[PDB]
Amino acid sequence: SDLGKKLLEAARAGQDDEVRILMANGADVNAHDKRGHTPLHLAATNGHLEIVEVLLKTGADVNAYDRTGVTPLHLAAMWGHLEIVEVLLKAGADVNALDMVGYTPLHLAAWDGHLEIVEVLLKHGADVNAQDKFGKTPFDLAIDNGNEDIAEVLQKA
Amino acid sequence: SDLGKKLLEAARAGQDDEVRILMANGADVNAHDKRGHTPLHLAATNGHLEIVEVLLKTGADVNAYDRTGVTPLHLAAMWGHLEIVEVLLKAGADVNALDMVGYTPLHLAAWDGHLEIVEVLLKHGADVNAQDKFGKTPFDLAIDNGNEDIAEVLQKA
Amino acid sequence: QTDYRIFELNKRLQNWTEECDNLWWDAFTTEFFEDDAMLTITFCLEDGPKRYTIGRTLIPRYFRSIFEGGATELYYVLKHPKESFHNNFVSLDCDQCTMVTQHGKPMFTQVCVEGRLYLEFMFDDMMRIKTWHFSIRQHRELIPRSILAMHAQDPQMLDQLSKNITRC
Amino acid sequence: QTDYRIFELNKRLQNWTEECDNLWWDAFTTEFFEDDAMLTITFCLEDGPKRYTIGRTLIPRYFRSIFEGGATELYYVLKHPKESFHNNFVSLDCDQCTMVTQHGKPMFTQVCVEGRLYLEFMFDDMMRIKTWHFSIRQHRELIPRSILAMHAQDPQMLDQLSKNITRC
Structure with a gap:
């Protein structure tokens, strides 16, 4: 609740030491704001790899979906965060998870234009x-966002 | 009143034929709007010389002042209307009339930058x-508005 | 009044710096767009087809990209927009919309992308954008007069300054 | 909200054409300025002193003059203005104000005059400007990239395009 918020704040600002004080003071790692964002959503959007790893380790729901049906793997893929995409898949993140719009992580990576992120998703069985x-x-x-390397690849599967 | 308005409108739009229909249908030539603008103010600002002449001829107050103390001669001088400045002086317009700001016609012509308009005012005893x-x-x-011809002249009196 | 909303939108964009995190773009999109918003961009018909259609999850990522170019400034100029009212929503059709970005520290180019912007807004307290369609006619680039003084006598540098740095 | 008022002011200026009469400038000044308003402009300190101070009767004539230049477009861009409240009035201090004009049909130059704009507004229903002080730091002129392509090979025409068409 009270602690809930401080832990979203700290997860956002990539404040590694302040995420530990809170987790040690009992902060809920599946705490959520009005949007339905968890620490994991937040840290996965701002690229905070170490916070992603430690949240996942203390039972943070890998597949938690916000009110728009959006998962951390959606966000990592959209914002172009390689290491976080790898860590989330290994903790079991759904590679073909659908938001309210019908976007998958692959859709979002196809947009962002991160060449490796697409192949990791395709390796992990993205549709x-x-x-x-x-x-x-x-x-x-x-094609739309003018990533012609990514489209070559996607023409194969 | 009703006719009052149509005659301000027509005086503004320089509509010569419509100023005659109204004056013939009894329109008040010293009619005024919320600002205290008369047909004469309006016609003198938009440069409608013939309407100025015919209003002055049917008893339009040459020296009528709006709520800011502004006279048609102020307006003719500010907007750079030579023939209207000449016609107003001849109908007795006060050459040293003061608005709420302490502006005279000469001040306003000194600004506008009309070389002849200044000399006509100076000839007619502008301070x-x-x-x-x-x-x-x-x-x-x-000097302020960068009319250095006008300032040469004004350095003489 | 819809026009206030695009003023407030241009005002928010002023707070953007390289120092802002990716989640700033989400909070920005939450303030001005609906959870099910749609955003279409139709690009100059001098090029090929080119046509973004994206839903809400990608809108933060769209706006961010405008500043990946070197753009450090973004506002939309709406000349003579038509407000219309309907049952659920208000439309705003602006045939004379200019998307203005300024590149560089210091500024070395301004980009004007002119087209029709159609918006639908939720008619509620929040007045958020349901729909965003910008069909672009043209884009022109302006450079400081100073840059031209500088390179007066450099045919090669004038040949490069001649070339657009964007496509639309 | 003072910021709405300068949006409404930029919006009104959009309705200006060569076809508008001198009394349009009076109706414009009545909507946005008090009957006893004051307007100060302090010009670039690269030149001499230069400093308009004018009362209400000359304000219509000031704004008109901005379009006597060939300017067919005028708006004020306020980056991060400070609203403060007092007994009789609201202040708006904007250190990053740009006065933007566009010259020509077609557009051949944009003029940005950057400075501090201080406004005082009547705190009543009408919210009209009591005081207007714009102290200018600098002005830069932008030209289409196209004009440079055109005259690449004309040293003389590039020498003329080098020169500012305004002073501030």
Whole structure:
């Protein structure tokens, strides 16, 4: 509750020492704000790898979805955070998880334009054929946002 | 009243034929709006010389002052209307009339930068020494607004 | 009044610095867009087809990208927009919208992307954007007059300053 | 909210055309300024002294003059203004104000005059400007990149395009 908030704040600001004080003072690691963002969502968006690892280790839900159906793996993939994408898949993050729009992580990485992040998702069995609300595939999104390397790859599966 | 308005409108839009229909239908030529603008103020600002002449002829007050103390001669001088400045002086317009700010016509012409308009005012006995609310003279205003011809002249009186 | 909302949007964008984190773009998108918002950009018909259509999760990532270019300044200028009212929502159709960005520290280029912007807004307390469609006609780039003085006598440097740094 | 008032002011200025009469400038000044308003402009300290101080009767004539230059477009950009409240009035101190004008049909130059704008506003229903002080730091002129492409090979025409068309 009270501690709930401080731990979202600290997870956001990548404040490693302050995440430990709170977790030791009993902060809920599956605490959520009005959006349905968890520490994991926040740390995964701002690229805070060490906080991702330690939250996952203390039972943070790898597959927690916000009110828009968005998971940390969606966010890591969209914002182009390689190491966090790898750590989340290993903690069991759903590679073909669907938000309210029908976006998968692959869709979001196809957009962001991170070459390796796409291959890691494809290696972990991302659906090359997944259609968002607008009938667009990761392929399509990579043409749209002008990532022609990524689209070569996506033309293979 | 009702007709009052149509005659301000027509005086503004320089609509010569519509000023005659109204004057013939009894429109008050010293009619005024919320500002205290008369047909004469309006026609003198938009440069409508013929309407100025015909209003002056049917008893329009040459020296009517709006709520800010502003006369048609102030307005003609500020907007750079030579023929209207000449017609107003001949109908007896006060050449050294003061608004709420202490502006004379000469101050306003000193600003506008109309070389002849200044000399006509000076010929008609404009005060070269008149000080606005800010202690500025027509001279000063012509330096301020970068009219160095006008200021040569004003350095003489 | 919809026009206040795009003023407030330009005002928020002023607070952006290289120092701002990715979650700033989410809080920004939460203030001005609905949870199910849609955003379409149709690009100059001098190029090929080109047409973003993205939902809410990608909108933070779209706006961020405008400043990945070197843009350090973004505002939308709406000349003579049409407000219309309906059952659930208000439309704002602006045929003369300019998206203005300024590149560089110091400023070395301004980019004006001119087109029609259509917005639908929720008619509630929050007045957030349901729909955003910007169909671009053209883009022009302006450079300081000073840069031209500088390189007057450098055919090669004038040849490079001739070239657009963006596509639209 | 004072910031809405300068949005409304930029919005009104959009309605200006060569086709507008001198009394449009009076109606404009009545909507945004008090009957006893004061307007000060302090010009670039690279030149001499230069300092307009004018009362209400000259304010219509001031704004008109901005478009006598060839300017067909005027708006004020306020980056991070400070609203403060007092007994009779609200202050708005904006250290990062840009006065933007665009010259020509078609546009051939944009003029940015950057300085501090201080406003005092009547705190009543009308929220009109009691006081207007703009102390200018600098001005820069931007030209289309296209104009530079055009005259690449014309030393003389590039020498003329080098020169500022305004002073501030």
